[PDB]
Amino acid sequence: KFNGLTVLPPLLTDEMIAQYTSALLAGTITSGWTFGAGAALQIPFAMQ
Amino acid sequence: LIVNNATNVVIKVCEFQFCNDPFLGVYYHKNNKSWMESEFRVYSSANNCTFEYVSQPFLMDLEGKQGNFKNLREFVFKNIDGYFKIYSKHTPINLVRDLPQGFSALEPLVDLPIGINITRFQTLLALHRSYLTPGDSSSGWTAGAAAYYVGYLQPRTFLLKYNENGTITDAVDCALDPLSETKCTLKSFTVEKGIYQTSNFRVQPTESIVRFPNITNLCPFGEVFNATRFASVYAWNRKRISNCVADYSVLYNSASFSTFKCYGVSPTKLNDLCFTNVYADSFVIRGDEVRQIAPGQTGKIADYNYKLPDDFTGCVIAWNSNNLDSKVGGNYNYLYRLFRKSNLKPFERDISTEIYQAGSTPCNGVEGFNCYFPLQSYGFQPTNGVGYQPYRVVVLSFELLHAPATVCGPKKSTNLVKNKCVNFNFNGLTGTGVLTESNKKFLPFQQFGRDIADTTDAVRDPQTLEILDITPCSFGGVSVITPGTNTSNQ
Amino acid sequence: VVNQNAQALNTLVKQLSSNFGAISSVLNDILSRLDPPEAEVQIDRLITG
Ligand SMILES: *[C@@H]1O[C@H](CO)[C@@H](O)[C@H](O)[C@H]1NC(C)=O
Ligand SMILES: *[C@@H]1O[C@H](CO)[C@@H](O)[C@H](O)[C@H]1NC(C)=O
Ligand SMILES: *[C@@H]1O[C@H](CO)[C@@H](O)[C@H](O)[C@H]1NC(C)=O
Ligand SMILES: *[C@@H]1O[C@H](CO)[C@@H](O)[C@H](O)[C@H]1NC(C)=O
Ligand SMILES: *[C@@H]1O[C@H](CO)[C@@H](O)[C@H](O)[C@H]1NC(C)=O
Ligand SMILES: *[C@@H]1O[C@H](CO)[C@@H](O)[C@H](O)[C@H]1NC(C)=O
DSSP states (O other), rough: OOSSSOOOOOSOHHHHHHHHHHHHHHHHHHHHTTGGGGSSSOTTTTTT | EEEEEOEEEEEEEEEEEEEEEEEEEEEEETTTEEEEEEEEEEEEEEEEEEEEEEEEOOOOOOOOOSSOOOEEEEEEEEEEEEEEEEEEEEEEOOOOOOOOOOOOEEEEEEEEEOOOOOOOOOOOEEESSSTTSSSSTTTTBBBOOOOOOOOOOOOOOOEEEEEEESOOEEEEESSSHHHHHHHHHHTOOOOOOOEEOOOOOOOOOEEEEEEOOOOOOOOOOTTTSSSSOOOOOOTTTEEESSSSSSGGGGSHHHHHOOOEEEESSOOOGTSSOEEEEEEEEEEEEEGGGGGGGGGEEEEEEIIIIIIOOTTTEEEEEEOOHHHHHHHHHEEHHHHHHHHHHOOOOOOOOOOOOOOOOOOOOSSOOOOTTTOOSSSEEEEEOOOSSSGEEEEEEEEEEEEESSSSBBBBOOOOOOOOOSSSOOEEEETTEEEEEEEEEEOOOTTTTTEEEETTTTEEEEEETTTTTEEEEOOOOOOOOOEESSSSSSTTTO | HHHHHHHHHOOOOHHHGGSSSSSSSSHHHHHHHSOOOEEEEEHHHHOOO
8 A cells, every 4th residue: 555556445335235135035035036027026935 | 128119119139227217208299189209218328239120110090099998919928948939919809997708819929039038027108298298207297098917927737629720719727626637637628427537646745854873083085095105006005984974075175186987876976875884995007007997997907906896886086196106217116917817806906926927837936938027117207108107096985775884974964853744864764754653672783674565664763772663645546526517517 | 366466466566676677676776876867777777677
């Protein structure tokens, strides 16, 4: 940092990435794949 | 003087005894309504004139008007490299007191090779006088309305736009406000939404400090430069010098030097640098031999007598010493090697005197045929060629910023400051940066602290024995946010 | 990835202490002890490196 050699912060803080991953997990467990095409449709887990 | 009288344009360059209040006075006669130039009180005398020029005759009005300002003139005056540059333009306008806002170009009009020094100037007006101006020259006069504005130039950097015909219609000042720096960077009068990088702001150091130990002794040069006697070149003499100031600007009152040259160091800086382990060599040679004292040379002196290392940083001084070392019979005290089996090494001295075997038939100390004595006597007399006369030659060699030293030359030390980006010299080491107290623990035999970055980061102050940490100033970076030119300027 | 990054930065930084054919590898060692005319050649060599 003391020669004109700078590092820069990423755009997303790690909490944001954590939120994204949590959202994906929730989507898969509670809606199968159906959230990846349109509105999130619920369905029990045994039938998924 | 630049003047535009009623008929001609006159450009004079002379020494004038100018009046305190020079001007022009035009009298208006009521009987015949006309304005005629009568008074021109400019200078008392004009002694020596160098350049002159007069333009063609012409006629203007010179009548007093009562309407509004209808002529705007702009002029720019430069003096660069002995050239007086006058750029001009004029425009019809209606504004009387306001200064108009417009974008007009100034076309070059006249350039002259004057080559003089101008540091002040004075404007020159006219006067109007009539029966309504009663009194003498000093009071019997009116003024008449006119106005002007003056401003100063400055070295800057602009961006200019050229239209199809070739005219400058617009420009942007690269250093006015950040949006302008952005337009300057992208080379476009339009900038679209986003972020940009322009430059880097650097904190600037204000003060400077010098930290030097105490030296009072003066160097033993009167027994090096004023030495009653000098030795033979082959047994060249050497001397160690320490703990003194080397005032080489006092090299001139007592004597003057045939040759005074320095390699790897510029002479002017010798006072500001702390040297290490001064060695002073001394000998006497022939003038012809004076061209052998240089790195990468040949000749018997340069081969069998004296040699310099290739990376010899230091100074060569030598002055002719004919009068002291010329004897009418011949100064034979000076002897030199001519024969040697091999070349000598730099900073080596050999005093062997053995019968040189030129070829076969080993001499066995006979000095017979093909057997010669390596040492030969210089014969110096007042009546000899300049290239043969004796010369006293001295070499100064030394180290720089590679070890604790004591020869610093003449300088002055000052106080100490903290926590402010400054500049510093520390026993000849240089640099800029905030100086805070250190928590390191130097051992009592070392004077620095180094990093992976390979730059110093601590220093032991040569006075207080204290340990100071250098922290560089925060250069950082500058970025700018804009919502586009079209939408806004903020 | 992290190892490669760190290695590259350390090499780029350590490369500041070589002569590249000059008398010294510090521009402050060349601001002094020289005048412009004969300093500029060694400043040139450092620039190239
Ligand atoms: C203007 O100056 C020129 C050059 O000195 C001179 O010949 C001419 O007579 C002058 N005219 C007036 C009206 O002063
Ligand atoms: C300048 O003026 C002085 C006094 O009139 C004169 O002696 C001298 O020769 C002049 N020099 C030139 C170059 O005209
Ligand atoms: C020009 O004259 C001014 C005032 O005497 C002086 O300060 C300045 O150094 C001069 N410059 C030159 C180049 O003669
Ligand atoms: C160029 O000059 C012509 C004639 O005055 C004018 O009609 C035209 O508008 C000018 N064009 C530009 C780009 O200034
Ligand atoms: C040499 O001698 C002169 C007077 O004889 C003296 O003033 C001077 O300081 C001396 N200089 C050196 C370099 O010995
Ligand atoms: C120099 O002299 C000062 C007092 O003038 C003294 O305090 C100091 O110890 C001396 N030595 C150094 C290296 O400053």
